[PDB]
């Protein structure tokens, strides 16, 4: 299970993690908030 | 078990029932196995021909082989096979279910719990060991299974005449039997024309002279031991009692291919289909006199086919032991 | 037989936390960036990652099973698209009106305008992969049929997944279970592909060919019998086909003209769906399975019986070829890549075969209409097959680099191949030159001579003809086949040869295809680009160890850059250099195989059909005036029916747009690491490396460019990822416009 | 569609000598025909092992097959 830690703090998943969640908010914030050309 | 001059020989696995052949403790396990087997294939199959059962259809064209013995004895039909009630039929098919967990339970039971020699056991367990060279304890054998093969013809006649009543072909309604037949002269006669019989009463006084020599015959074994004639002409080893057995067998699967396809009363027409005229090409098979639709036969066509075919190979394994148990090694030619 | 090892792997995530460990210079951590993409690389060099073969073996049958796992989910994922997200329900309602779609996006940013009109109220992304027509020739009726093949696709991924790790880490075969090669094609023909076939024409018969009897007689698709009435009642197969009624007796008797109701060769084409016969395919698969599994029982195993492998390639020797295939046998018992090759090489040469059976023998109800689906299937089966022969060529030049024992290769037909490289190479050299001067240089020709105004000078049906004799010939033997050599036939293979045009909802189903100039000087150049592609690979294969520059390339390796500036410059002269040019080469030659079928099916197959039965074809016959010039390739193919993908800008099809836009960007970036070189691009990145020691922000791990070897590998990837993601974009977007 | 007959003892008996044209084939030419699983009994069978006896009957079989498919073809039988 440590080394499992270990895996899922890897270089590639951890990016993988981070885009998705940015990806999360972009896509909750263009739902609820769209077509936001200028504020 | 003929294991002639070597008596300790290792089986293998395809021939790997004959290790037990000495062990009286696993010959009852394997047996009471084969009556859990027995008992399944009756109570499944008879809830499996319930379940494939149209009763618009005739029972005789549709492959069913359980409901029709049930329905000559006259459970689940009215007049003229209609079956209008088949509850009996679920019945007696849920019975032999449990009666199979039963007998289930007693094979592993004597796989596991008792051992593979009952010579271990103390009490009245020792006194059930059996080995293939005492005289008595095989007439012993032989005296209480007669003596439940005789209860069995009794209780089909206590089911013909008391409580229930088997089914006629002839004025198709099921009966009562009141007045079966008694006549030792009446019943002796049968030795020429015992597949043409057409009456009830007198198929109910054969099992009742049948129920008592069978009765009477497990009497004379359990009173009297195998005499030094019987002691001389047969042997009495493990594979040649097998032997007669299997000839016994076979005769009578014979006999029951040949009540099966030509008679109308044991066997009625209603039920099975119509009776067979008996063909012969490279085997004495048993046609159809009239066509069906498809290639499905009828279901006495079924069963005779089969019968014959199963009481040849039994005939054929009989050959085989009695040869064996002679001392024919089949490694000679 | 039977011999596993019992927990040779143990079962943790100690390794999973710690990458490179399978490589001895990679278990130290990383240094530099070149050892992130060296993990990548190196990964599945299960050879290079263990010594042993035993070792190698065990890891390369559990990669399978993950891999079928990965293939499982997939379509796992296929089916549950097309029970949940998907018109399937619709369609087959109406198959001539209502467009296949199982793919729904998200209304979000605008996307949502993909969501197109596909017929019936159902808003998706209309899908070109023939999901639809396959389901309905497999009789799928509900939705929920799909759905239980989504869930047990599943179900066989975990037991891939579980399989994957049992025969690794609990009970991993010995090398003998894995060389036991006439054990494993006994298994493969008759078992595999034998049983295989066996139970899809016991599926075809029992479920494909009652369901869409009763689909093309006009049963609606909530009537049709359920496939397992059939199995429980057979008076409902006994309707449809009468020989049900005499069951299995007449196939134990040889009595097997009763079933030939179900079981025919009836040939040609289903009028009702423009797909074959599924009584054909049935009889197909039957035929195919019975010789499958009589061929699974040629070699020799446990009972004594059968043909040693060894013994039959031992006997094939000759005057011509001295030792023979003495020593083949050692070669694929004991190399992975070696076997590895001839499959790849075959696998590759199927899924063309596929690829050009599909579209003139359409297998599928309303697939030959479906032209988007006809021109996506023979496309993506022609680019799958691409890639798996230029990795014949690379396992091939892999073996060579590694598993060539000279020892036991003396005077064998491999050895005696490499004792005349220059033979077979300048021939083959001097064949691609031909080729390419007489074939490409008749399009220059009549390009020249129609930019002259000299038409009479072209090479063309009109002027100088070159037709195409022999295939016009072998095309009249089929469409005479049916009653003089076919006797049994009632119609021809394929209308492609000729005869009946098919039409189903209007539209032309299949047509004979007419092979004049123009399709002789276009096989011609197919015939060019598979043999310069042909050229590579095999210089890869047969040059990988030694040659007249390098005579040590075999101990540099299968994958390096070079052997330095000198001897003039050794530059790409790596086994691994051949399969980076012949990927562009396969990318030339298929791409060249799928413009000549976008165009001849468009302009004399694909069409609407007249009442009367005339036929408008889609570009109205421009291929024999047009396909024998490039510039009539660049205005009448390229220019003409590319108008689709860049109108569909606001539209269900703009996606298609964007990503030809995006396949156009993607081969203009492939061509920065292709054209440029990493001793540029290190003194480049040393100095943002100084604007990153400048602020303190200089990584430990050392930022390098690209190795050489990486730098082709990126850019021949962008490439073909460019390259092909346009030829898509522009293929469907076409193909869903025109019909 | 080709001609093909019912069941009958001229099936029969040309698919048993079919059997025993390839089991007179299989005796000349198998090379291994005792090795693995034996016959109960080696005599009466040319010393063939349970692989050689299968192996055998099954191209009888498809020799029976062939045979009787391409007579009934041709109307011999
Ligand atoms: C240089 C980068 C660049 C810039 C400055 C923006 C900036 C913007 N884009 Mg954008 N976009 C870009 C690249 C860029 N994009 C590319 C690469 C794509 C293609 C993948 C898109 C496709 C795109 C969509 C489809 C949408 C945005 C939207 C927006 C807005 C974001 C509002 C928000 O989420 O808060 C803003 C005007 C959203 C918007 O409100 O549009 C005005 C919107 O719907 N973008
Ligand atoms: C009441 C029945 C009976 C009894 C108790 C015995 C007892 C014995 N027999 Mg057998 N024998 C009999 C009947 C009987 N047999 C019959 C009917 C045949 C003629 C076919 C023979 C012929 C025979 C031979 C050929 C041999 C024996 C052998 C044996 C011994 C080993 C058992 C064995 O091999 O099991 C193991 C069981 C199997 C491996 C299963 C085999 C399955 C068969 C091949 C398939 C049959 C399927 C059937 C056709 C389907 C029926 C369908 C249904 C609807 C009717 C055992 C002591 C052996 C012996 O004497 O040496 C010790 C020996 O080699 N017997
Ligand atoms: C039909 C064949 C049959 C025969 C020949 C035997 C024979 C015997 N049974 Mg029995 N038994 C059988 C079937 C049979 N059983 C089945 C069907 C079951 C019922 C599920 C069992 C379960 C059973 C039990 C639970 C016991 C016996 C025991 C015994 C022994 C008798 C001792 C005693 O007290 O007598 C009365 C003897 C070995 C006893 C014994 O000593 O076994 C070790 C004992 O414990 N039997
Ligand atoms: C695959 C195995 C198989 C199957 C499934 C059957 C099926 C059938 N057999 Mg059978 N048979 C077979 C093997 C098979 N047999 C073999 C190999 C033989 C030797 C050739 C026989 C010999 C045979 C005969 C002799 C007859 C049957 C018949 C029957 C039918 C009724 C059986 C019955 O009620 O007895 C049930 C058994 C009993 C009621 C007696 C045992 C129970 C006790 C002792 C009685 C009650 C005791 C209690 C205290 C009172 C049934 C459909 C009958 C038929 O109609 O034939 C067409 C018939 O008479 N069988
Ligand atoms: C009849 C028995 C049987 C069948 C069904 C197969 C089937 C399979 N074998 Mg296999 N094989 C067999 C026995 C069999 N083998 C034996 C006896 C040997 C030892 C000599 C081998 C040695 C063996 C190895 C060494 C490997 C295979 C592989 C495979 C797969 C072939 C490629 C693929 O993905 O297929 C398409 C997949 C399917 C059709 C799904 C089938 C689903 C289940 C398995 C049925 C396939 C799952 C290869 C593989 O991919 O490993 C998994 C692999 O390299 N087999
Ligand atoms: C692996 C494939 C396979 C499977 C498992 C089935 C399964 C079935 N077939 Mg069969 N069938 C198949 C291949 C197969 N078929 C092929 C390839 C043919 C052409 C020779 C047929 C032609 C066929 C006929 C003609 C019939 C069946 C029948 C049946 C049933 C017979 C069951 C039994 O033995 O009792 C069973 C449901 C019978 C049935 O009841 O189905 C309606 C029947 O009439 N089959
Ligand atoms: C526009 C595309 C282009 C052209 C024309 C060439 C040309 C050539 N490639 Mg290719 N190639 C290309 C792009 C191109 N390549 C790219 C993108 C790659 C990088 C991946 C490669 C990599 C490469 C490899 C890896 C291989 C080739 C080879 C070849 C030759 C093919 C066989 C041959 O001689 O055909 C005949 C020549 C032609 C078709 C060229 C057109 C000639 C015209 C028709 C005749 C002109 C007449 C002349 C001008 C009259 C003289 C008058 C005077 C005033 C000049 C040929 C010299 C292969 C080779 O050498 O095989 C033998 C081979 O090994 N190519
Ligand atoms: C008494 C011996 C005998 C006779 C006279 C026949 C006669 C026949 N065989 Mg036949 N056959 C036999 C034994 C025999 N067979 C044997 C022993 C085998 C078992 C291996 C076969 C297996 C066999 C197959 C596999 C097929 C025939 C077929 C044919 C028929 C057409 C053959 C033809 O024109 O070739 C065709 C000529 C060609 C040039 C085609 C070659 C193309 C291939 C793909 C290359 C013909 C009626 C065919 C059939 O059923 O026709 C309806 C067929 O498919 N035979
Ligand atoms: C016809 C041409 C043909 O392919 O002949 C094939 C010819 C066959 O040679 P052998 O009779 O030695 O072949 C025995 C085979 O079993 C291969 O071992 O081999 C060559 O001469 C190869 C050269 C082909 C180069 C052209
Ligand atoms: C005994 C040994 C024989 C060796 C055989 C070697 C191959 C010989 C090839 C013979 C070529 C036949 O010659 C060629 O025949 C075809 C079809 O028959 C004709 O082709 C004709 O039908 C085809 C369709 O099938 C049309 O597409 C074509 O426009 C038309 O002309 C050609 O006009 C003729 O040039
Ligand atoms: C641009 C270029 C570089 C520089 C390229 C470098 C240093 C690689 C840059 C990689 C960046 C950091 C990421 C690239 C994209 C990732 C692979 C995507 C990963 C997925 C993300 C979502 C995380 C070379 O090193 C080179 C070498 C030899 C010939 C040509 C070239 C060449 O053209």
């Known amino acids: 299970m440590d080394g499992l830690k270990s895996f899922l703090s890897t270089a590639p998943v951890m990016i993988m993690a981070l885009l998705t969640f940015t990806a999360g908010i972009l896509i909750e914030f263009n739902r609820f908030y769209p077509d936001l050309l200028f504020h | 078990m003929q294991t002639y001059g070597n008596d300790t020989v290792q089986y293998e696995w395809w021939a790997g029932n004959a290790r037990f052949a000495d062990q009286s403790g696993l010959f009852i396990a394997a047996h009471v196995a084969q009556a859990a087997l027995t008992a399944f294939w009756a109570g499944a199959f008879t809830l499996f021909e319930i379940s494939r059962f149209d009763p618009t259809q005739a029972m005789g064209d549709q492959g069913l082989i359980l409901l029709p013995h049930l329905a000559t004895l006259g459970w689940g039909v009215g007049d003229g096979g209609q079956i209008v009630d088949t509850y009996p039929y679920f019945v007696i098919g849920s019975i032999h279910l449990i009666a199979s967990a039963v007998l289930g339970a007693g094979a592993l039971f004597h796989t596991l719990r008792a051992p593979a020699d009952l010579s271990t056991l103390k009490g009245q367990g020792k006194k059930f060991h059996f080995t293939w060279e005492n005289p008595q304890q095989l007439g012993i054998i032989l005296g209480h299974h007669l003596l439940f093969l005789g209860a069995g013809a009794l209780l089909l006649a206590g089911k013909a005449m008391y409580w229930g009543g088997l089914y006629d072909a002839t004025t198709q309604t099921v009966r009562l039997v009141s007045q079966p037949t008694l006549d030792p002269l009446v019943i002796y006669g049968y030795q020429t024309h015992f597949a043409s019989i057409s009456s009830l009463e007198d198929l109910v006084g054969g099992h009742i002279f049948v129920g008592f020599l069978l009765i009477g015959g497990g009497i004379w074994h359990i009173l009297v031991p195998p005499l030094g004639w019987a002691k001389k002409v047969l042997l009495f080893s493990g594979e040649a009692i097998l032997s007669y057995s299997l000839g016994g067998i076979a005769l009578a699967g014979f006999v029951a291919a040949y009540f099966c396809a030509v008679n109308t009363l044991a066997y009625p027409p209603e039920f099975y289909g119509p009776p067979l005229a008996i063909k012969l090409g490279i085997f004495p098979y048993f046609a159809d006199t009239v066509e069906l639709p498809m290639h499905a036969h009828t279901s006495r066509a079924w069963l005779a086919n089969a019968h014959f075919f199963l009481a040849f190979f039994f005939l054929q394994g009989h050959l085989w032991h009695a040869l064996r148990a002679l001392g024919f090694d089949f490694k000679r030619v | 037989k039977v011999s596993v090892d019992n927990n040779p792997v143990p079962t943790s995530f100690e390794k999973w936390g710690k990458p490179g460990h399978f490589d001895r210079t990679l278990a130290r951590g990383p240094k530099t960036t070149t050892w992130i993409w060296n993990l990548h690389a190196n990964a599945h060099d299960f050879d290079s990652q263990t010594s042993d073969l035993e070792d190698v073996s065990r890891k390369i049958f559990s990669a399978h099973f993950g ?32 467009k296949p779609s199982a793919q729904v996006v998200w209304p979000i940013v605008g996307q949502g305008i993909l969501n197109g009109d596909v017929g019936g109220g159902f808003h998706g992304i209309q899908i070109t992969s023939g999901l639809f027509y396959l389901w309905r020739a497999s009789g799928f009726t509900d939705s929920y049929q799909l759905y239980c093949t989504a869930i047990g696709g599943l179900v066989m991924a975990a037991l891939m997944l579980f399989a994957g790790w049992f025969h690794y880490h609990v009970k991993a075969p010995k090398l003998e279970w894995f060389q036991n090669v006439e054990s494993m094609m006994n298994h493969h023909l008759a078992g595999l592909l034998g049983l295989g076939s066996l139970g899809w024409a016991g599926h075809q018969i029992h479920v494909s060919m009652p369901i869409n009897k009763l689909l093309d007689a006009g049963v609606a698709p909530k009537d049709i019998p359920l496939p397992h009435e059939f199995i429980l009642e057979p008076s409902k197969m006994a309707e449809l086909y009468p020989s049900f009624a005499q069951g299995l007796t007449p196939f134990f008797t040889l009595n097997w003209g009763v079933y030939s109701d179900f079981l025919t060769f009836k040939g040609g084409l289903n009028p009702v769906t423009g797909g074959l016969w599924l009584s054909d395919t049935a009889h197909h698969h039957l035929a195919i399975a019975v010789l499958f599994i009589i061929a699974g029982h040629m070699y020799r195993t446990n009972w004594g019986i059968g043909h040693s492998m060894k013994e039959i390639l031992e006997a094939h020797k000759g005057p011509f070829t001295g030792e023979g295939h003495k020593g083949l046998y050692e070669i694929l018992t004991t190399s992975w890549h070696a076997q590895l090759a001839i499959n790849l090489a075959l696998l590759g040469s199927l899924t063309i075969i596929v690829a050009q059976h599909m579209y003139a023998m359409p297998p599928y109800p309303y697939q030959a209409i479906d032209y988007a689906t006809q021109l996506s299937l023979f496309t993506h089966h022609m680019w799958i097959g691409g890639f798996l022969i230029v990795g014949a060529g690379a396992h091939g030049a892999i073996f060579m680099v590694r598993d060539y024992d000279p020892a036991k290769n003396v005077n064998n037909l491999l050895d005696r191949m490499l004792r005349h490289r220059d033979a077979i190479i300048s021939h083959l050299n001097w064949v691609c030159i031909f080729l390419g001067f007489h074939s490409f240089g008749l399009y220059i020709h009549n390009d020249t001579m129609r930019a002259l105004g000299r038409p009479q000078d072209m090479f063309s049906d009109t002027a100088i003809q070159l037709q195409p004799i022999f295939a016009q010939w072998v095309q009249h033997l089929h469409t005479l086949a049916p009653g003089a050599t076919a006797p049994n036939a009632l119609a021809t293979a394929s209308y492609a040869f000729g005869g009946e045009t098919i039409a189903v909802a209007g539209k032309v189903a299949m047509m004979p295809i007419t092979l004049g100039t123009a399709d002789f000087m276009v096989h011609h150049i197919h015939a060019f680009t598979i043999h310069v592609t042909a050229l590579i690979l095999l210089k890869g294969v047969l040059y990988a160890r030694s040659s007249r520059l390098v005579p040590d390339k ?186 | 569609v080709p001609a093909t007959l019912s069941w009958s003892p001229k099936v029969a008996g040309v698919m048993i000598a079919c059997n025993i044209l390839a089991i007179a084939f299989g005796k000349l030419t198998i090379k291994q025909q005792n090795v693995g699983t034996p016959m109960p009994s080696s005599n009466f069978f040319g010393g063939f092992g349970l692989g050689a006896v299968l192996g055998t009957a099954s191209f009888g079989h498809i020799l029976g097959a062939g045979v009787i498919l391409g007579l009934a073809n041709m109307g011999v039988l």
Not at chain 3, 68 to 87: E, I, R
Request: hydrophobic content about 50%.
């Open chain 3, 554 to 739: 075999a101990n540099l390796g299968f994958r390096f850059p070079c052997d330095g500036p000198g001897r003039g410059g050794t530059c790409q002269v790596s086994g691994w250099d051949h399969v980076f040019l012949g990927l562009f080469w396969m990318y030339n030659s298929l791409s060249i195989v799928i413009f000549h079928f976008s165009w001849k099916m468009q302009s004399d197959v694909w069409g609407t059909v007249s009442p009367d039965g005339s036929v408008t074809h889609v570009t109205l016959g421009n291929f024999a005036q047009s396909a024998i010039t490039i510039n009539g390739w660049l205005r009448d193919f390229l220019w003409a029916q590319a108008a689709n993908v860049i109108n569909s800008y606001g539209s269900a099809l703009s996606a298609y747009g964007i990503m030809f836009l995006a396949g156009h960007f993607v081969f203009a970036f492939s061509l920065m690491f292709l054209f440029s070189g990493r001793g540029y691009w290190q003194e480049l990145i040393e100095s943002i490396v100084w604007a990153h020691n400048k602020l303190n922000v200089a990584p430990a791990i050392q930022p390098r460019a690209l190795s050489i070897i990486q730098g082709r590998a990126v850019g021949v990837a962008h490439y073909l990822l460019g390259g092909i993601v346009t030829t898509w974009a522009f293929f469907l977007a076409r193909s869903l416009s025109i019909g």
């Open chain 3, 67 to 98: 891999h079928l796992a990965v293939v499982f989910v997939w379509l796992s994922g296929m089916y549950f698209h097309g029970a949940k997200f998907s018109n399937y329900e619709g369609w087959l309602a109406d198959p001539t009106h209502i």
